[PDB]
Amino acid sequence: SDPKLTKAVDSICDQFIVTKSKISQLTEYFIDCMEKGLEPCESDISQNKGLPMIPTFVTDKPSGQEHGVTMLAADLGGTNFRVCSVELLGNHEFKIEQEKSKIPTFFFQDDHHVTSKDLFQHMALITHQFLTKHHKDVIQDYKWKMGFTFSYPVDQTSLSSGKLIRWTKGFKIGDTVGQDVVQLFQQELNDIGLSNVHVVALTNDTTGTLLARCYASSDAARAINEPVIGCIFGTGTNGCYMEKLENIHKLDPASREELLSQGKTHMCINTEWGSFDNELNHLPTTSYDIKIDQQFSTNPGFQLFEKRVSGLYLGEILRNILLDLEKQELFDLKESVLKNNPFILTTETLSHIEIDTVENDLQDTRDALLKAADLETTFEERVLIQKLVRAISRRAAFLAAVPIAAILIKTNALNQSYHCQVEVGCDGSVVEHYPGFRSMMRHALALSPIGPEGERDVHLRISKDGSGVGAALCALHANY
Amino acid sequence: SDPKLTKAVDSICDQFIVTKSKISQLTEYFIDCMEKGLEPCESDISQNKGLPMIPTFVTDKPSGQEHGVTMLAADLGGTNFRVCSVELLGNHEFKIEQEKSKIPTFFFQDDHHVTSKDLFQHMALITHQFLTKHHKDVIQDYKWKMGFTFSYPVDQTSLSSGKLIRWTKGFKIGDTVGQDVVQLFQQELNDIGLSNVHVVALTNDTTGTLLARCYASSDAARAINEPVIGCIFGTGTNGCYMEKLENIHKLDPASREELLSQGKTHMCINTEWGSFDNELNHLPTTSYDIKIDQQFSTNPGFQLFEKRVSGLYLGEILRNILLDLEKQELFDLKESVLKNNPFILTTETLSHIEIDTVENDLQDTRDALLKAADLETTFEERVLIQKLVRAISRRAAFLAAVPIAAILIKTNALNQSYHCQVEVGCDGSVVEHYPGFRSMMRHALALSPIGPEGERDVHLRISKDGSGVGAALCALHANY
Ligand SMILES: OC[C@H]1O[C@H](O)[C@@H](O)[C@@H](O)[C@@H]1O
Ligand SMILES: OC[C@H]1O[C@H](O)[C@@H](O)[C@@H](O)[C@@H]1O
Known part of the structure; x- marks a missing residue:
């Protein structure tokens, strides 16, 4: 046992603490x-x-x-592309067939130049594969309506139009920025014989999650818990909510009055809260966060809240901590492959460490670190790595509660009726599968200004239904 | 409006308050x-x-x-009898066919003499009707094993034997007390030609609820939320938990060592917490509670906690309050049928009042009171009746949290592992369908000694699986 290392780890863990006053x-x-x-x-x-x-x-x-x-x-x-067919049957019920495929690594590498046509041709081809497998008899005949869930910031101009503002996460395709992604996709669909497939709706994955929960929640369940936020805690993080039209001052005033006259009162807002406080005026920041933002990420200066929260970055934080402890001659990296291998440690790796038990000599931690970067470890080394992992994820979960608490406070969502609660629909591998992430989020909500009585009125519900149902709902509304 | 009535009602509502000190x-x-x-x-x-x-x-x-x-x-x-066939497919999955039938009124009336044979003959015929409908080809052939879920206190002596301690709810069949209900049931099965049906297990509906959740809960869901309590909040209320063998001192000391030598460490305990504080050393008590216990219930002096909590009695509490307000010449009962009609107001009636809205002039309340006992009401009267209902249900929900907090504290269940949470499997019409009952239970849990941080670690989950899966699991283990 090396006490000097133990004190260095304990001091780093303290840097990740988020206090109640900080949450406030x-x-x-x-x-x-x-x-x-x-x-x-x-x-x-x-x-x-x-x-x-x-x-x-x-x-x-x-x-x-x-x-x-x-x-x-x-x-x-951020990681996969999926095509699905959704049949909305009414009465909160639907039939869904889907095919999920990982985004090929080719699209995330910059060694060779990649273009938008490469990406959307690949998406169009998979759409063809899907229709061939699940709807083989009407692939080329039917006038298909398609909703497009695009989990990237888009300068939305209508339900069916919007230009990519900037890539996030692992994408860095240059020529896509500033282009209407619905048109790019439609062109590649036309060029492989799927011109009968009309992309008629464009939604963020947050928007789709909120719409899907509004549909599937039973009349009884929804009368108790009204869905007010659709958010994502997966590869990236983001959330949406309903804002009063009068408060959307960036909206064209004449368009606002038109909508208000039609009986509309709110419009869904894609907060893009991964880019909360990009200037770091108040977000917690360690030396490891700076290296991830400035050296190892595709989008330096943007998505900084996300770089502390989402699954793409939590594992990389551990890597930067271990490289720093080795530079100080406090931790032996052995013959591992951590150096000069960004993102080799994944949040999935960390999920095996969060609740690993010392009664098993932390073998899941041993196996997971060997699989990720061939880092052999001692028991005392794993004990300390677990303390670090638990500090990274708790900070991520505590920060994750802040945007939700703020939205609920701003919109006075908790001022309802007797026995009335609100639902926050959550999707993504972290909130759904990272051990304890949701529990720590609820702790941070209870420390937030809404208090414990507020946290009990909030239901973080895993919406694994998917934003495909949400996209389908937008396509049903739209014209072919 | 009526100031004298408003002050009397507000004073009654205050009597139902349960404070944090009382919960503790x-x-x-x-x-x-x-x-x-x-x-x-x-x-x-x-x-x-x-x-x-x-x-x-x-x-x-x-x-x-x-x-x-x-x-x-x-x-x-307490209200229905159901027979069912359960196919345990493994991997937390099962196939179930069931038939549910109401217990005939004959068994709840004392005008005509009722015997155990009446009850268990009728159950034997229903079992025959079920096997004839759903298993017509093997009714008389198969060597059926049956689990018997008996939701009444039993002096259990083995998995397959136990004598009725006392009836509860609406049952008062005298000669059943002190008899092994498995034998009584088996005799009538034999006597209608179903001797090939062997009743091999006897469980309370609490025990069955816990066992069912342990089976159906996925390994992942169960690794985060370990089921530690199976409880009921329906016609009656009760709960069970796993107690260390060493603490079960009423068990034969030699039997304890035998079980311990077999690798066993705990045994499920049927607390029968409906009979918590039957002597009223600390339970809140109103004049209305005394009238329910001493005049209108089948079991005076027993199940006193239950008579303040469970669905069989909540509506009767309101009836006795209105009769007192009419006795005081503050409320006009008009041509209603409340007098000399115990239990005419049901907890179902109250469920229509709990979240009725003034924007509808409390029409759900008006219709529910007219449907049950032809009680015409004014809007101002309904405003006050709603306050009474909300006071009755909150007191029920707050008291409902006490046994759960107690069990969790006694067994030190909430602080076991990092990210440790527990599941409390709840079944019954009240907890499942009474608006806000679970929400108010969670409030009371947070005020209890486990605190808000404890309540966040407790998942009150509706167990719609049923005690049939629980009983089936016991029968599979048992020998024909
Ligand atoms: O995928 C979650 C989230 O990741 C990033 O923050 C952005 O691209 C968002 O547009 C997206 O919703
Ligand atoms: O049915 C729930 C509960 O009701 C009463 O309290 C008793 O009969 C218990 O044995 C039973 O478990």
Whole structure:
């Protein structure tokens, strides 16, 4: 046992603590950033470093009674692409067939130049494969309507149009920025004989999650828990909510009055809260966060909240900590492959360490670290690595509660009726599968200004239904 | 409006308040009663006024991988009888066919003499009708094993034997007390030609609820939430938990060592917490509670906790309050049928009042009161009636949390591993369908000694699986 190392680890773990006062600060600051983000854009939307707060042009929360013929949906996430067909049967029920495939590594590597046509041709081809397998008899005949879930910031101009503001996560395809992604996708669909497939809706994965929960929640369950947020804690992190039209001052005033006259009162806002406090005025920041933001990430200066929370980055934080402890001659990295191998340690690796037990000599930690980077470890080394992992994930979970607390506070969502609660629909591998992440989120909600009595009125529900149902709901509404 | 009536109602509502100090007192007192209840009693088990704390002789929580041929199950509740066949397919999955039938009124009336043979003959015929409908080709051939879920206190002597301690709810069949209900049931099965149906297990509906959740809970869901309590909040209320063998002092000391030598460490305990504090040393008590216990209930002096909590009695509490307000010449009962009609107001009636809205002039309340007893009401009267209902249900929900907090504290269940949470499997119409009952239970848990941090670690989950899966699991284990 090396006491000098144990004290160094304990001091690093302390850096990741987020106090109740910090949660209070970040909550009020987040609301401030929400209000500034709702004001008319000063600079160019692609270079604006504030909270994006992007109007989605979705104003109606599904009732659950929507019904229609089979819709198509395509969902480009941070890690996978999936095509599915959704049949909305009404009465909160649907039939879904889907195919999920990992985004080929070719699209995340910059060694060779990659273009938008490569990506959307690949997406179009998989769409063809899907229709061949599940709808072989009507692939080329039917007038398919498709909803496109695009989990990236888009300068939305209507339900069916919007230009990519900037890539996030692992994408760095240059020529896509500033282009309408619905058109890029439609062109590649046309060129392989699927011109009968009309992409008629474009949604963020947050928007789709909220719409899907509004539909599938039973009349009884929804009368108790009204869905008010659709958010994501997977490869990246983000969330949406319903904002009063009058407060969306960046929206064209005449368009606002038109919507208000039509009976609409709110529009869904894609906060893009991964880019909360990109200037680091208040977010906790360690030396490891700086190296991830400035050297190892594809988007330096953006998505900084996300770089402390989402699954793409938690494992890389551990890597930067271990490299620092080895530079100080406190931790022996052996013949591992950690050096010069960014993102080799994944959040999935960490998920095997979070609740590993010392009664098993932390063997899951031993096996997981050997599999990821061939890092052999002693028991005392694993004990200390577990302390670090638990500090990284707790900070991620505590920060994860801040945007939710802020939205609920700003919209006075908890001021309801007797026995009335709100649902926060959550999707993504971290919130769903990382041991304890949700529990720690709820702790941070209880420390937040909404208090423990507020946390009990909030239900973080895993919406594994998917944003495909949400995209399908938008396609049902739209015209072919 | 009516100031004198408003002040009387507001004063009654205050009498139903349960404070944090009371919850703490009742929680610690409940633990004391658990410990006294685990000591060997020498008195008549039917006359003991303490917490029964009945060993169930169930020592093994299912793994979820249990599999076998189709088992039978019989479930006598407080309101319905159901027979069902359960096919355990392993991997937390099962196939179930069931038939549910209401217990005939004949068994709840005392005008005509009722005997155990009447009850168990009728159950034998229903079992025959079930096997004729769903297993017509092997009714008389197969060597059926049946699990018997009997939701009443039983002096359990093995998994397959136990004498009725006393009826509860609406049952008062005299000659059943002191008789092995498995033998009574088996005799009538033999006597209608179903001697090939062997009743091989006898469980309380609490025990069955816990065993069912242990089986159906996925390995992943169960690794985060370990089921530690199976409880009921329906017609009656009760719960079970796993107690260390060493603490079950009423068990034969030699039998304890035999079980311990076999690798067993715990045995499920049927607390029978409906009979918590039958002597009213600390339970809140109103004049209305006394009238229910001494005049309108079948079992005066027993099940007093239950008579403040469970669905059989909540509506009757309101009736007795209105009769007192009419006795005081403050409320006009008009031409209603409340007088001399005990239990005419049901907990179902109250469920329509709990979340009725003034925006509808409380029309759900008006219709529910007219449907039940032809009680015409004004809007201002309904405003006050709603306050009474909300006071009755909150007191029920707050008291409902006390046994759960007590069990978790006694067994030190919430602080076991990092990220440690527990599942409390709840079944019954009240907890499942009464608006806000679970929400208010969680409030009371947070006020209890486990605190808000404890409540966040407790998952009150609705167990719609049923005690049939639980009974089937016991029958699969048992020998034909
Ligand atoms: O995938 C989650 C989330 O990741 C990033 O933060 C952004 O690309 C968002 O648009 C997206 O919703
Ligand atoms: O049915 C729930 C519960 O009701 C009463 O309290 C008793 O009959 C218990 O034996 C039973 O478990």
